Design a protein around this ligand. Structure first.
Ligand SMILES: [Mn+2]
Ligand SMILES: [Mn+2]
Length: 332
């Protein structure tokens, strides 16, 4: 009879420089849709599980997108939790941490944040959240197998915070939600997913996560269930961040809890607003493929080599001209 609904998204990479193209229009459309979605489903909180910005120094238009989203979300009463990813700067996200607190927004950039009660819209306790961002090794490692040390450090961190969450919850029939931003064992990755913990942790075994009712992860751009556990998920990025993800569905998760436990995870399709395409073949294959839309499709021309990589450039740069589309990548 008591519900708690959250939206799980991650890997926005606001401000991404995509082959000299801006993603501002796509991100604007996405954030607008996310606002509408929060209202349609009467969502209590949105959790952004890391990699808010593509870099530690986002351009003004990206900072503006982020700020305006948080402001517009105030018309809903929905709470916002923003976690840092490995792409984010901790100092950059912390610039606005205390300001955001006046706008029903909890910015968690560094390790060590205590578990906190997420309210329902009506103010009453809805869930206990363990707000865990990308964990910088320096912030969790004790006293300097370095591989084994980091895995144990992360595992212990989750155990300590899960224990605190259980204590904070007390007797209340509340779900516990934990977040994270890392790569799990078995995860399927994309080109735009940068290696983390390089040399210190190949991947995190999801069996080491504490038994939260939901684990909202970011870092991996393709939505997927982890370790065969429906309650442990990557939502994936909301727009395609590399050509290898185009054509594939983009999601945010609607996660509903009932009487203190996970009830359902629904996959909400994020509308795709910028057409993209990857071509593979020969000059004639591509010429056939290049057949015949207001926003012009962005192209990646890939194949086996024809002749000098520089010569192929001018070849394709001639085959593409006066056409209703653009051409961003050309490899071999
Ligand atoms: Mn990312
Ligand atoms: Mn990441």
């Amino acid at each position: 009879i008591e519900f708690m609904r959250i939206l799980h998204t991650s890997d926005w990479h606001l401000g991404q420089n995509f082959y000299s193209k801006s993603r501002e229009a796509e991100h604007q459309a996405f954030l607008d849709w996310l606002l509408e979605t929060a209202q349609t489903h009467q969502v209590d909180a949105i959790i952004v599980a890391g990699d808010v910005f593509d870099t530690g120094s986002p351009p003004s238009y990206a900072r503006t997108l982020y700020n305006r989203f948080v402001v517009n979300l105030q018309q809903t009463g929905c709470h916002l939790v923003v976690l840092a990813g490995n792409h984010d700067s901790v100092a950059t996200l912390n610039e606005s941490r205390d300001i955001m607190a006046f706008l029903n927004t909890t910015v968690v950039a560094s390790a060590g944040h205590a578990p906190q009660i997420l309210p329902r819209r009506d103010g009453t306790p809805g869930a206990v959240l363990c707000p865990i961002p990308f964990l910088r090794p320096r912030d969790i490692i004790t006293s300097q197998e370095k591989q084994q040390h980091l895995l144990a450090a992360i595992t212990d961190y989750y155990q300590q915070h899960y224990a605190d969450a259980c204590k904070l919850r007390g007797d209340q029939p509340l779900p516990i939600i934990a977040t994270g931003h890392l790569t799990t064992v078995g995860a399927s990755k994309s080109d735009a997913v940068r290696d983390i913990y390089i040399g210190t942790l190949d991947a995190f075994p999801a069996q080491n996560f504490p038994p939260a009712d939901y684990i909202a992860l970011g870092h991996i751009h393709r939505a997927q269930i982890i370790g065969g556990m429906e309650h442990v998920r990557y939502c994936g990025s909301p727009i395609p961040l590399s050509f290898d993800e185009c054509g594939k569905s983009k999601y945010v998760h609607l996660v509903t809890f009932s009487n203190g436990k996970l009830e359902s995870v629904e996959n909400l399709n994020v509308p795709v607003t910028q057409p993209m395409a990857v071509l593979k073949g020969d000059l004639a294959s591509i010429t056939a493929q290049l057949e015949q839309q207001e926003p012009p499709v962005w192209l990646d021309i890939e194949i086996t080599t024809d002749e000098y990589l520089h010569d192929i450039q001018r070849k394709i740069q001639a085959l593409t001209e006066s056409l209703p589309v653009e051409v961003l990548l050309v490899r071999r």
